[PDB]
Design an enzyme around this catalytic site. Structure first.
Site, PDB file in Angstrom:
ATOM      1  CE  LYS A 119     -20.520  93.154 -41.559  1.00  0.00           C
ATOM      2  NZ  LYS A 119     -21.630  92.802 -40.630  1.00  0.00           N
ATOM      3  CG  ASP A 150     -19.455  86.732 -34.016  1.00  0.00           C
ATOM      4  OD1 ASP A 150     -20.094  85.689 -33.796  1.00  0.00           O
ATOM      5  OD2 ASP A 150     -18.244  86.756 -34.282  1.00  0.00           O
ATOM      6  CG  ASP A 170      -7.176  93.480 -33.372  1.00  0.00           C
ATOM      7  OD1 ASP A 170      -8.379  93.583 -33.038  1.00  0.00           O
ATOM      8  OD2 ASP A 170      -6.565  94.380 -34.014  1.00  0.00           O
ATOM      9  CG  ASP A 211     -23.063  91.062 -37.756  1.00  0.00           C
ATOM     10  OD1 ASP A 211     -22.043  90.711 -38.384  1.00  0.00           O
ATOM     11  OD2 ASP A 211     -23.116  91.239 -36.516  1.00  0.00           O
ATOM     12  CB  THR A 231     -20.661  87.367 -41.155  1.00  0.00           C
ATOM     13  OG1 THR A 231     -20.020  87.378 -39.888  1.00  0.00           O
ATOM     14  CG2 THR A 231     -20.188  86.147 -41.961  1.00  0.00           C
TER      15      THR A 231
HETATM   16 MG    MG Z   1     -21.762  91.819 -35.125  1.00  0.00          MG
END
Ligand code: MG
Ligand code: ADN
Ligand code: ADN
Ligand code: ADN
Ligand code: ADN
Ligand code: MG
Lengths: 467, 467
Positions: free
Chosen positions: A290, A52, A204, A50, A247
């Site tokens: 994800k 972040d 968001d 991943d 990611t």
């Molecule tokens: Mg992350």
């Protein structure tokens, strides 16, 4: 000193790859990889990452405070009261993994079974007897995902604190009348649920439509930990297997952040030519979505890396040098890299979307990065005497002193206590790390300190009747 | 000697309530209550029971063989081949908790993560390399409940063996041609999925429309363990709290079986007047429909106990002496008995429908009865040297001898091994008992050997970084 201060201090050290130095280093808890289930590194063929809060760890409290500030500004711009502008992020309040109860407006710290460990309404920490009015069995139904929202990632720290700020504000502002499920102002009723949804929408929005990414990229040194050992570790992984990125971020932001993470006057080690970040990966996949990724996923697309836009159409071709994918599914990675799940070690920070779901849906091996662990370890060792005492008090009970020591211990970590426990009671997050993260650490870089033939060992588990 | 032989031998002993005798008795593993999570018995206000395979333990292999025989007869009567009539139940084959894969027709023993421990196609036990053809990651997705069926209860032992018998039969009968997903006979194709559904339908049919219940009740001594200590334990529970029955069975069958379980020339102890079974319960609820019971449940009905039919209408009245309920929900029990979930200890054999769901949905305390444990404990102690060796071999590995000892150990329990493990690997069932059963035992009667102020203690759990 924040957890990211600890991480950046370690990041600033160059690698000493002398084998005795490495062994000595990884014995320090800060630099160790912890093991829930045994894992023979020799059997790992693919290392996946991943981005972040895994590769790119945002500095604290600066990044949380920026998120907080922009989220508050968005709420005020849609019509929330101007008093919100007087709020300021407080890193001492939130702990990760709390549950917001949208019915009654409480932040809850719970165990794996939904038992209440802590309940705060705004900044009012509710004692056991009073909690029974709303939670008659001191219990929540975790399956009720329409009511309860688990704040799983470090991205959720700002909103954790903001929710408490808002409940506190509306409760104590005389313009509003408090009800069990929200607040009234004349002919307008704001439920805690509607409030929560506005906050979620605003977070968001700042990330996707607002200025957060622009402000981050314009001062990367202020907001993102950088570690020259990263290309060293990835180059070493590529010597024994394949390396991939999967990611949720889009290509343009991924490229900006990744470029920064590799921005040194060298490649893998000092003295070597610098290499583009993309060269460290056999497969690069953005817009992963994800955990849907680990089920049906989405249509496989190809990124036009010159423009950062997706090419039109589903991509039906092979893995080729320089290609960047968007969407797809975990099966894309297995097929293209010639891997089965147990051949893959996936490294990420999202206990649900990266770790639980890859484990349960696909039988991948898992490595959970827990950035706060550096600081949690400092506290755990520095205040070991309070836990030691609690252990003895629990044993001698075979009670109000137990509550007092539990509180004092918990307060060392923050107002919401340790990520991993309240006193002797493990949190939901702790339980999920144990059950779904094969390995875990303060940083993925700790893998650098072990050989690739290393056998990470956990003791065999026995049932009570077998013991 | 079967597990039920062990249980009936213990059932035949009268209670010696001398406190030193009791303490001595409960130290023997057979008579012990095992503890996964601490539980202070003093805090339990209500004791609730399931009936079948909890209070009423059916004798083995007689009851399984009767179920098997009737199920085969039903399949033949709907058109399955006459060769089925040559099958005979074999108690040495099935272990409880196996997964039938309806796609490929395999019985699987899996761990908590869906990893394959054993795979049998008919009576052909498939080795690791060959399993990869159908299970490329030696893994199943437990979330795929349309494909995989977990055989959780002792009622499922006949069908476990029958499924294997059928796959074996069709595979080796030259009238049929085997395909990956079933069998062809000319212009008729029978998928393993359709086969499985016929077996499931036939088991349900024998229990609900066929003769199984009639044959059981006509020879209760042949089919049902009886224990004079039962009214003693229930009378003692009623001294300190409330006692309830919540069973999926209907009133007429419940009444027959319960009457038998209390059919002694005495009440709680020898010398006392006999008392109707119903008198031992503060609340009796049949047709419970667990686990739906622990969610919305069904409409609350009242049984007319004279006719055994339900009264017409939803029952809106209070708890009254002599009333028997049907349907409802777990909230019915909490409301009428004045209990919260943590005040209730629910005792049953269904890991999913009695224990997991009451724990997760309602925060009830849980006691899992595992009838086979008596026999499993005998084997565990009698063959401890094989496990001890395996432990040493695993340690010295820090390989083909490990596989050989694993096989020899597993074979001591039956063709499908222990309920709780294959070698060093714990089964799904083991993991679920640990995670959701607060207490567990070979029999609920083992509670008799502990005082009601007893504190059942389990060690506090630590994460790897805390250790
Ligand atoms: Mg992350
Ligand atoms: N950490 C988590 N975050 C969000 N959802 C979760 C988490 N853990 C389990 N769940 C989901 O919540 C429900 C179980 O309580 C299931 O749908 C499960 O997938
Ligand atoms: N951050 C906090 N500040 C004040 N009290 C707390 C905090 N966290 C938990 N508590 C209190 O400690 C008690 C449990 O140890 C509860 O009354 C709970 O309100
Ligand atoms: N022992 C079990 N028997 C049947 N279903 C189960 C069992 N354990 C979990 N499940 C269900 O299977 C799915 C998870 O694999 C969920 O729907 C869960 O409720
Ligand atoms: N009941 C059984 N009979 C024969 N072989 C078995 C049985 N159970 C497991 N095995 C075999 O033992 C090996 C794993 O220890 C596998 O090849 C598996 O086929
Ligand atoms: Mg039962």
């Amino acid at each position: 000193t924040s957890w990211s201060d600890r991480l950046q201090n370690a990041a600033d050290m160059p690698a000493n790859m002398d084998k005795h130095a490495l062994k000595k280093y990884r014995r320090e808890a800060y630099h160790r990889v912890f093991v829930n289930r045994s894992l023979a590194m020799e059997k790992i063929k693919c290392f996946g990452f991943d981005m972040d809060y895994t590769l790119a760890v945002y500095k604290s409290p600066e990044y949380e405070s920026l998120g907080f500030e922009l989220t508050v500004e968005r709420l005020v711009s849609i019509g929330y009261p101007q008093e919100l502008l007087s709020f300021a992020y407080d890193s001492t309040f939130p702990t990760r993994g709390l549950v917001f109860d949208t019915l009654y407006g409480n932040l809850l710290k719970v165990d794996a079974y939904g038992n209440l460990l802590v309940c705060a309404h705004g900044f009012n920490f509710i004692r056991g007897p009073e909690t029974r009015e709303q939670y008659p069995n001191k219990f929540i139904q975790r399956d009720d995902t329409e009511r309860f929202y688990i704040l799983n990632t470090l991205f959720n720290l700002p909103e954790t604190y903001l929710l408490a700020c808002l409940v506190d504000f509306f409760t104590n502002c005389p313009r509003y009348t408090s009800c069990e499920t929200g607040f009234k102002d004349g002919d307008l009723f704001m439920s805690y649920r509607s409030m929560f949804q506005d906050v979620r929408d605003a977070v968001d929005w700042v990330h996707y439509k607002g200025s957060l990414k622009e402000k981050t990229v314009e001062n990367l040194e202020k907001y993102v930990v950088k570690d020259g050992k990263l290309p060293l570790l990835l180059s070493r992984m590529k010597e024994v297997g394949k390396v991939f990125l999967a990611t949720n971020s889009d290509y343009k932001y991924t490229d900006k952040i990744m470029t920064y993470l590799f921005d040194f006057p060298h490649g893998p080690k000092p003295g070597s030519s610098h290499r583009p970040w993309q060269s460290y990966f056999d497969l690069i996949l953005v817009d992963a979505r994800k955990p849907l990724f680990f089920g049906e996923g989405t249509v496989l697309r190809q990124v036009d890396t010159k423009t950062g836009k997706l090419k039109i159409g589903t991509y039906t071709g092979p893995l080729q040098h320089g290609i960047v994918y968007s969407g797809g599914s975990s099966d894309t990675i297995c097929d293209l890299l010639g891997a089965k799940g147990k051949d893959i070690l996936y490294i990420g920070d999202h206990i649900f979307g990266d770790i639980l779901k890859s484990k349960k849906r696909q039988g991948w091996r898992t490595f959970l990065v827990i950035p706060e662990l550096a600081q949690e370890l400092h506290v755990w060792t520095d205040k070991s005497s309070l836990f030691e005492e609690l252990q003895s008090l629990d044993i001698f009970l075979a009670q109000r002193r137990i509550k007092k020591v539990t509180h004092d211990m918990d307060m060392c970590y923050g107002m919401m206590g340790s990520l991993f426990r309240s006193g002797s009671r493990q949190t939901l997050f702790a339980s999920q790390v144990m059950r779904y993260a094969d390995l875990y650490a303060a940083s993925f870089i700790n893998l650098l300190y072990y050989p690739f033939s290393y056998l990470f060992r956990a003791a065999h588990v026995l049932m009570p009747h077998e013991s």
